[PDB]
Amino acid sequence: PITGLVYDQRMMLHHNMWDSHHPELPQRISRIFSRHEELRLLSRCHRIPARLATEEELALCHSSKHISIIKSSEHMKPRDLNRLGDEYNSIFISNESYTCALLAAGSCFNSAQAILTGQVRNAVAIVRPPGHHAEKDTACGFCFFNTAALTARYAQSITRESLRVLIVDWDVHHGNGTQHIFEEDDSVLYISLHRYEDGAFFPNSEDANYDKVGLGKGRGYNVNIPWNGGKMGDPEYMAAFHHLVMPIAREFAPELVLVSAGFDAARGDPLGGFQVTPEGYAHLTHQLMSLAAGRVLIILEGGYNLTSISESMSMCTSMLLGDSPPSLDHLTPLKTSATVSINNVLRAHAPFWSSL
Numbered sequence: 303p304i305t306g307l308v309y310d311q312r313m314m315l316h317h318n319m320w321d322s323h324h325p326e327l328p329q330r331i332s333r334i335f336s337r338h339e340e341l342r343l344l345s346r347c348h349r350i351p352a353r354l355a356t357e358e359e360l361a362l363c364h365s366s367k368h369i370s371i372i373k374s375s376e377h378m379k380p381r382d383l384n385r386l387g388d389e390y391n392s393i394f395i396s397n398e399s400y401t402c403a404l405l406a407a408g409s410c411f412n413s414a415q416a417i418l419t420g421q422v423r424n425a426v427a428i429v430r431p432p433g434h435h436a437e438k439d440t441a442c443g444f445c446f447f448n449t450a451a452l453t454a455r456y457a458q459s460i461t462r463e464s465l466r467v468l469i470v471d472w473d474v475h476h477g478n479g480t481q482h483i484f485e486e487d488d489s490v491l492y493i494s495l496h497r498y499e500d501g502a503f504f505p506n507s508e509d510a511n512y513d514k515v516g517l518g519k520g521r522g523y524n525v526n527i528p529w530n531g532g533k534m535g536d537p538e539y540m541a542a543f544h545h546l547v548m549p550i551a552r553e554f555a556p557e558l559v560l561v562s563a564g565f566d567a568a569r570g571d572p573l574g575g576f577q578v579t580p581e582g583y584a585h586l587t588h589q590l591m592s593l594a595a596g597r598v599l600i601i602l603e604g605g606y607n608l609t610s611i612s613e614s615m616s617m618c619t620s621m622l623l624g625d626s627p628p629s630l631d632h633l634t635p636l637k638t639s640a641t642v643s644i645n646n647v648l649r650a651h652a653p654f655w656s657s658l
């Protein structure tokens with residue numbers, strides 16, 4: 303069994319012209335890549351080439367107007383780049399942003415293709431800018447195009463329209479864009495765990511609550527696991543996976559698993575305030591590998607402590623390669639509010655999933 307890896311240094315060119323120290327740094331992906339080399343993980347993987355997504359591929363999820371506007375940023379003057387960035391919630395743009403976003407999506411397309419055609423069993427994509435806040439018609443939260451959602455649609459386009467795709471989003475923030483793109487869809491099961499705080503955490507919408515279960519034929523195929531009341535870690539994520547993510551995922555029986563793998567719930571993250579450990583992320587990865595004949599693609603989203611994300615994603619790759627899961631700490635008892643959250647989600651999703 304072969305693990306694939308895609309990384310292209312050109313995705314470092316997207317940058318914040320107003321604040322060179324903004325945490326969504328080019329060095330996020332180069333530090334992760336260097337750690338894969340130091341831990342001798344990189345040489346164990348099949349190297350998947352990056353490529354640009356095409357505009358027809360972007361149109362699987364995004365409107366013609368959104369694609370055109372972001373594409374035009376490649377040729378804008380600084381004053382226009384500044385004005386364009388201000389037309390979105392939490393976006394900075396440079397002349398290289400569009401190309402980097404194309405590279406991030408196209409890299410994931412090549413990895414999903416490699417997985418689905420049997421060239422590799424599973425794969426990891428070290429990409430930026432991230433994707434899961436991007437909506438059909440707008441950029442948001444450092445995301446221009448929704449890489450994970452696009453990869454699900456691309457995978458369906460090269461197999462069959464009904465290919466069952468699971469997206470697990472363990473970035474600390476809700477993937478509002480991914481939820482909305484698939485809200486009415488029963489072919490793509492979206493499961494997000496995220497810091498919620500009764501709506502007082504980015505992206506600041508009640509769409510992230512546990513009672514948003516999907517719409518129409520998609521009812522039951524949107525699973526929000528919202529955390530409230532302080533710092534969650536390995537015990538809470540392991541419990542949510544044990545009682546919610548994996549039972550629902552097994553009943554759905556995905557043919558492809560995409561992980562929106564932000565590492566901003568990691569211990570040490572300056573923005574997330576949580577303390578999932580690298581061993582925790584290894585155990586989450588190892589559980590997902592029991593799905594979909596092992597067809598798992600791990601896609602970088604957020605995560606802003608350079609050392610934490612480098613250790614955390616390297617631990618995921620080590621699991622994909624088949625290494626034994628590392629020992630976890632003594633798991634402290636579940637925090638009270640996490641028990642509440644799990645009970646709320648179970649109650650909301652019991653109508654739809656007999657295994658609950």
Ligand SMILES: C[C@H](NC(=O)[C@H](CC(=O)NCC(C)(C)C)NC(=O)c1ccc(C(=O)NO)cc1)C(=O)NCc1ccccc1
Binds near residue numbers: 390443
């Ligand atoms: C005030 C509020 N602030 C933000 O939205 C900050 C903006 C920023 O960059 N701050 C610098 C900092 C990151 C160092 C804190 N963004 C995030 O906190 C953030 C963090 C992580 C991810 C992510 O993707 N993780 O994976 C996405 C977004 C803001 O702008 N309102 C403007 C508005 C306009 C229009 C409507 C509503 C609102």
Ligand SMILES: [K+]
Binds near residue numbers: 471472473495496
């Ligand atoms: K999430």
Ligand SMILES: [K+]
Binds near residue numbers: 484487488492
């Ligand atoms: K869905």
Ligand SMILES: [Zn+2]
Binds near residue numbers: 475566604
């Ligand atoms: Zn995030």
